Amino acid sequence: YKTKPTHGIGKYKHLIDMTLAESYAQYVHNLCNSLSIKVEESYAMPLTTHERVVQISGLSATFAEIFLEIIQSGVRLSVXXXXXXXXXXXXXXXX
Amino acid sequence: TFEETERRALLLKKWSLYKQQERKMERDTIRAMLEAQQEALEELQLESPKLHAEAIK
Amino acid sequence: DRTSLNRKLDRNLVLLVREKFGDQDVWILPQAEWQPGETLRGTAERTLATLSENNMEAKFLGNAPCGHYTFKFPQAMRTESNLGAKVFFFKALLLTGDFSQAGNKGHHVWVTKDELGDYLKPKYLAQVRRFVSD
């Protein structure tokens, strides 16, 4: 009841090659999860070629750098633009 | 076949064992880096603040 | 006092220099003391150019501006200027530039972390190097 000391006890609203590439993407996702970063989305973009994405948002420079290094440590990368090499992968950021 | 299956299970187990160690190692490495960073920031603060600020940016 | 330091990597092999040919058969990373009137990264790049002879691209602070005066400060024996000195670090990538042993260096090679040499200790320590690698 409103006037009772147990007022808002129920209140809840306020609380609320290709294969290889895929594997790599998965790994990246896992890493992100581990390190506590928001993985927003992932795509399945179209000899043959195959692209995968891991959309990321919010990470400080030092931490970000570390993450990048870990990713670096095959196929390719593309996010300052930071490309590298060993089908295709493209971890687009939003820091 | 049975024998093959048995072999396979063992192999899988081995793989699992391997992966965890690697993961642990990676974690340790990360931790080390973090520690270094922590040290570094403190040092910067102690020494010259402008530089520290720049680093942070 | 201020000391810029770099850590250029290729094939998972870190590079090393011999400034003061007679005294330093022992190796360190290619960097001396700070440069006034110039910005950290830029200064580092300049230093690298002076030593290794290249264009250079510093990524940022990796994760370990080491300090060094805190952990294992320069040796009391021999006339070494033991003062308060910060040890800034940098991770970087080269674009192009051939090597040249002249003036301020004797030799320049690339070596594994586990295959570590004698090493000086005031500028760069083996343990410190390992930590940075980690």
Next chain:
RNA sequence: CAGAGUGUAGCUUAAAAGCACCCAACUUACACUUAGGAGAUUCAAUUGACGCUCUGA
């Protein structure tokens, strides 16, 4: 190489636990679930002696 804090596996007003963690399958992937996997009181009688963290040289 001299001191101080101590010292249950990642982590705990745990006492060999529960959380974490790993592999496979379902999953675009994550997530969930189902199967499995691996781990510890640093060591000698509350005392001493090996391991770290930290401060000196």
